[PDB]
Amino acid sequence: EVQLVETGGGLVQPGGSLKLSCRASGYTFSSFAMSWVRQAPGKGLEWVSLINDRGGLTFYVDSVKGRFTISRDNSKNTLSLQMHSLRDGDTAVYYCATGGMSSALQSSKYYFDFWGQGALVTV
Amino acid sequence: SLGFLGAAGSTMGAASMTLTVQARNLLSGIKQLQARVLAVEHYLRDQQLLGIWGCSGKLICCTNVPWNSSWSNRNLSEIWDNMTWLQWDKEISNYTQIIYGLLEESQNQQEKNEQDLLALD
Amino acid sequence: SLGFLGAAGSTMGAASMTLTVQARNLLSGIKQLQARVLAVEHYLRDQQLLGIWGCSGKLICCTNVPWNSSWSNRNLSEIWDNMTWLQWDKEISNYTQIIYGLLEESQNQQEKNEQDLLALD
Amino acid sequence: SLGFLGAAGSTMGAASMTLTVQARNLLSGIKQLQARVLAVEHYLRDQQLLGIWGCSGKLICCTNVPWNSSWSNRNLSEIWDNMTWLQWDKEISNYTQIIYGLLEESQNQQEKNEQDLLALD
Amino acid sequence: NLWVTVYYGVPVWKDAETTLFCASDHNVWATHACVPTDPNPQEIHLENVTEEFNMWKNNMVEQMHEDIISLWDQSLKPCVKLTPLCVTLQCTNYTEKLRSMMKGELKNCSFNMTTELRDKKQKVYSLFYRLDVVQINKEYRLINCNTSAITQACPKVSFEPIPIHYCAPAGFAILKCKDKKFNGTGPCPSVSTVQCTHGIKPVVSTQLLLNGSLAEEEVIIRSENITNNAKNILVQLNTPVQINCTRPNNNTVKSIRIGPGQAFYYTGDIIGHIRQAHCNVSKATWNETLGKVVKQLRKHFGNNTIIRFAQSSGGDLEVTTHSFNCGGEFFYCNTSGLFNSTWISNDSITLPCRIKQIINMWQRIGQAMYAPPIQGVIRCVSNITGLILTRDGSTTETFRPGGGDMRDNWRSELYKYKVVKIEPLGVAPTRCKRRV
Amino acid sequence: IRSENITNNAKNILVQLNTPVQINCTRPNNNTVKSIRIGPGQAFYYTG
Amino acid sequence: NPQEIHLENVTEEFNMWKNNMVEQMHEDIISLWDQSLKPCVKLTPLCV
């Protein structure tokens, strides 16, 4: 029942700015924390960013801490990642997923229970 | 020291150096009891309000609510050097409750956010 | 906003979003003065209790006392999503003083520990 | 536990471990009301004084004001192990207001310093 | 795994008994001492709160009782004390030619009354109701001389029952049941929170409840037990029954000074014919009212039975008759025309009413009030909104008018409210650990 | 024996005993009491 | 040792005709006066 659909650009020259938006359905969007996980075509999975359910708190992997912004709009059920600088090493398939955190009064997560199809971003 | 309210005619910047003078003087048969009880209620209402905003232990409490300009379009020199607190209180009267509401909302998010940050092993 | 006690029938999680509303309504001849003084004494006794626990400026305060299961063996979903605060109050009533005692002891240890750390050059 | 004031004859060090016992006991027809109000006024004046010093939430609060020796030339063991708090209060009575004045100035400077540090982008 | 988290501002409460303060937007009830009301009061519906109410253990009724007694006594203290009235009276029947029900009522009594100067006396003629004058073996005395002095009510202070609101102090709240079928006790699933109650008119009456507030949908019968016939049964009506009652005599009031600044008021004479005071309740409306009451009683006592209404049993006039204030005058209406029927499985009812000027109110002994006369004809129109019934100690049940414990009238009006103490603190397990 | 001064004869001396001394005291007369009303609700009591 | 603190740059609007200190002073004087006369001989026997 749970679906995550990632829509965004697939090509950007180095130094470009792009946005990826993951729209969720089949569950209460505002009840789950969500994150983005990156996988270069020849590499394994890499965690990139994590956002809370409310959106007040954001965390990033050190490699992108000064260049990527994660935000979510809970009324449209949409999680968006805005990338800046977009240096070559960021060419990869990006996936959005639920999980990775809970808001203190919920059972813990620290795992990604639902994954989207992903989107390939070429730098 | 200028004494109780002695800074009332001074600029807001200069007046900010005497906050403890008025704070001390906020606390320091039916009529006697009603007036002193009333003084206590006013003190506690102000302390409760600071508590809600997360300012319970401070006289100068720096918060996370941005200034919206419409409330007052004066720059920092025009406000802190060329005005007294009485003039400011008159100028900002119509926006006082708006600011207070925003202060409450900001602290609520911070407490919830802190609660979540402390839940990360 | 649902107003004072509007969240009383809501779940424990949802009602946590209205903590400031009830706080405001705790402060806001002989009979009237006794009623006003009693309201002040109850407010101050609760604030003193929070102070002893190190929660003097918070509406939501996290502590270092573990939950001992015997007090309530419900999981977080049952407590926060499927119960109200009135039901919880009743469920945890017999253990409230035990918890309060532990909270006092925890803060005392932290104050001593803090005092020692600040003594290290 | 020794109960309220049971530590009065104990050393200052040992007596520092019972601060919550007395703290609970500062708060817990016209005469009854007036005394209840007076107890509230004394409690609030002491809590307000602690707030001025930045100690609003602590029973043991460390400060940044050095001991001037003239106030008392005893060593730490002479004060904390060989004396009671009653003896200390008598010995330090003449300097109590001096110490309080210094504490107020220290906190005022600290608030300005915090205000300036929070203004560095 | 989980840690104790302290919350302040938790929306919970416990049953409590505290002091309430009056609110109100001369009069016996001191709205001057009371506080002005909120012109736009709030009421907060609790969508999922069910709470247990008990109108019979509600301490708001006991406090209202003490406040009404206190305000009554404070009102009478700054008034003329009629110590000079306990004198020998020489009384004759005012009109020996009456052929009406009023024959024997209204005696023309003469007495040597004091004057402003201590050295002088004046001869005073006045009319007293028969109930106020008792023969001393013609020679008569006032009925109160046997037990107490009389404080004269101030003629400038109205007896109109101006609404009084009870408002809780901060830290406490009042819960309103808002349940159209609530019978006065037990769970109420539609509780809303108010800080203060609606205004309550301190209407003083026995047997029948006047004004106050009507039931929204049907007659509601409230009793502590039902089974125990010694308890009063409070019946709240769905529709009001108008009772049009008057004191038709055009009494002319005269006054004299009885001491320095001490003025005494008395009925001087009556202009025109002497007529009996009375109440008028429509027969059709009352019969419908009783029909509703009988079906609601049958729901508790059983069907296929006989419900009988009968006149009240003997006892003090205040209890055996329908006592009430009208215009400041005190009426004691027979009521037997309203409770004279057996219910088995325009054309009004006229009730005689007695007038009494010496009132021994609140069932107390040692205090008395002289109700001064009112010039002219008195007419009141009021709504009957409830009944106080008792049951005889069986196929047939018999119900009679009851009353005399004034707290039950306030129990009827306060059935919707409960006072609770707010407990803003609580603890709960969370995953949030204080950072050490 | 407690006193503000002892030496000053103008002060009272309060003597606290170690053991009590019983004092058996009576009014042996079998007084029969009458009462009258002296005003409206005002009763006066006297020995009859 | 009463204090008075001069406000060097404060100008304020006064209006002695709406000053509520006067109403309290009046009420207090009336109250003192009546309390003073209350515990005194009341000459009702003099009105002869």
Ligand SMILES: *[C@@H]1O[C@H](CO)[C@@H](O[C@@H]2O[C@H](CO)[C@@H](O[C@@H]3O[C@H](CO[C@H]4O[C@H](CO)[C@@H](O)[C@H](O)[C@@H]4O)[C@@H](O)[C@H](O[C@H]4O[C@H](CO)[C@@H](O)[C@H](O)[C@@H]4O[C@H]4O[C@H](CO)[C@@H](O)[C@H](O)[C@@H]4O)[C@@H]3O)[C@H](O)[C@H]2NC(C)=O)[C@H](O)[C@H]1NC(C)=O
């Ligand atoms: C403090 O201490 C003092 C002593 O220092 C003490 O005083 C004594 O009080 C008692 C009463 O309690 C007095 O007792 C009376 O004594 C006479 C004489 O009794 C002697 O003679 C008879 C002869 O038969 C002997 O049996 C007896 O042992 C003695 O030798 C009696 O006449 C009195 O009796 C009358 O009063 C009694 C009270 O209850 C009645 O029961 C009794 O029937 C008598 O009265 C009735 O009968 C009479 C018949 O004649 C009739 O006339 C009466 O109207 C009535 O109907 C009584 O016992 C004793 O004398 C006192 N002693 C002294 C030295 O004065 C205090 O009592 C004590 N106080 C306290 C508080 O502790």
Ligand SMILES: *[C@@H]1O[C@H](CO)[C@@H](O[C@@H]2O[C@H](CO)[C@@H](O[C@@H]3O[C@H](CO)[C@@H](O)[C@H](O[C@H]4O[C@H](CO)[C@@H](O)[C@H](O)[C@@H]4O)[C@@H]3O)[C@H](O)[C@H]2NC(C)=O)[C@H](O)[C@H]1NC(C)=O
């Ligand atoms: C139940 O409620 C009804 C309606 O509220 C109530 O009946 C009303 O009673 C009052 C007081 O008796 C009536 O108002 C009076 O009407 C006459 C008409 O001439 C006026 O003269 C009165 O004012 C004069 O007298 C007062 C005496 O104190 C003075 O204070 C005043 O300054 C004037 O001199 C006064 O307005 C009112 O008319 C009726 N209402 C109707 C519709 O008849 C009834 O009493 C309540 N039930 C009970 C048991 O009290």
Ligand SMILES: *[C@@H]1O[C@H](CO)[C@@H](O[C@@H]2O[C@H](CO)[C@@H](O)[C@H](O)[C@H]2NC(C)=O)[C@H](O)[C@H]1NC(C)=O
């Ligand atoms: C009310 O009026 C009726 C008469 O209309 C009185 O009823 C009488 O009561 C006495 C006892 O007091 C009985 O012996 C009579 O048989 C009754 N007569 C009727 C016709 O019912 C009644 O007592 C009156 N009540 C008061 C309090 O005055």
Ligand SMILES: *[C@@H]1O[C@H](CO)[C@@H](O)[C@H](O)[C@H]1NC(C)=O
């Ligand atoms: C009043 O204003 C003058 C300048 O006009 C200034 O020098 C003086 O210090 C001010 N007084 C106070 C108390 O601030």
Ligand SMILES: *[C@@H]1O[C@H](CO)[C@@H](O)[C@H](O)[C@H]1NC(C)=O
């Ligand atoms: C400033 O206030 C106005 C209303 O006075 C409001 O429309 C506007 O959004 C506010 N601006 C911000 C940035 O909050």
Ligand SMILES: *[C@@H]1O[C@H](CO)[C@@H](O)[C@H](O)[C@H]1NC(C)=O
């Ligand atoms: C506040 O609003 C009123 C509305 O009449 C206006 O007259 C007044 O000047 C306003 N004050 C400020 C400081 O904006």
Ligand SMILES: *[C@@H]1O[C@H](CO)[C@@H](O)[C@H](O)[C@H]1NC(C)=O
């Ligand atoms: C009451 O419970 C219902 C159950 O569906 C819920 O939708 C509603 O929000 C609750 N009321 C409040 C005030 O939370």
Ligand SMILES: *[C@@H]1O[C@H](CO)[C@@H](O)[C@H](O)[C@H]1NC(C)=O
């Ligand atoms: C938990 O409670 C039990 C009694 O039910 C007690 O024996 C035990 O010591 C408690 N444990 C802790 C860690 O407080």
Ligand SMILES: *[C@@H]1O[C@H](CO)[C@@H](O)[C@H](O)[C@H]1NC(C)=O
């Ligand atoms: C608390 O103790 C009472 C003692 O009678 C008992 O009835 C009640 O069930 C206890 N409550 C809990 C939640 O253990």
Ligand SMILES: *[C@@H]1O[C@H](CO)[C@@H](O)[C@H](O)[C@H]1NC(C)=O
């Ligand atoms: C009193 O002093 C003695 C000295 O040995 C010590 O043992 C004892 O603990 C002291 N009492 C208290 C209450 O500290």
Ligand SMILES: *[C@@H]1O[C@H](CO)[C@@H](O)[C@H](O)[C@H]1NC(C)=O
């Ligand atoms: C200590 O106090 C004396 C006065 O008793 C003063 O002269 C001296 O400066 C003080 N020392 C310090 C370091 O503040």
Ligand SMILES: *[C@@H]1O[C@H](CO)[C@@H](O)[C@H](O)[C@H]1NC(C)=O
């Ligand atoms: C405090 O001052 C008084 C003044 O008479 C003096 O007697 C006393 O010794 C002083 N105490 C100390 C501890 O300096």
Ligand SMILES: *[C@@H]1O[C@H](CO)[C@@H](O)[C@H](O)[C@H]1NC(C)=O
């Ligand atoms: C007044 O009327 C009553 C009616 O019973 C009668 O008994 C009484 O004797 C009459 N009094 C006089 C003085 O005629």
Ligand SMILES: *[C@@H]1O[C@H](CO)[C@@H](O)[C@H](O)[C@H]1NC(C)=O
């Ligand atoms: C008034 O006093 C006179 C004195 O002679 C007496 O005759 C008369 O009966 C008294 N009047 C009344 C009504 O008692």
Ligand SMILES: *[C@@H]1O[C@H](CO)[C@@H](O)[C@H](O)[C@H]1NC(C)=O
């Ligand atoms: C006086 O009061 C008593 C109280 O019991 C009562 O019995 C008696 O009848 C009263 N006197 C008269 C004349 O009614």
Ligand SMILES: *[C@@H]1O[C@H](CO)[C@@H](O)[C@H](O)[C@H]1NC(C)=O
């Ligand atoms: C009111 O209804 C409750 C419902 O439980 C019942 O227990 C109680 O006996 C009823 N009381 C009356 C007087 O009908």
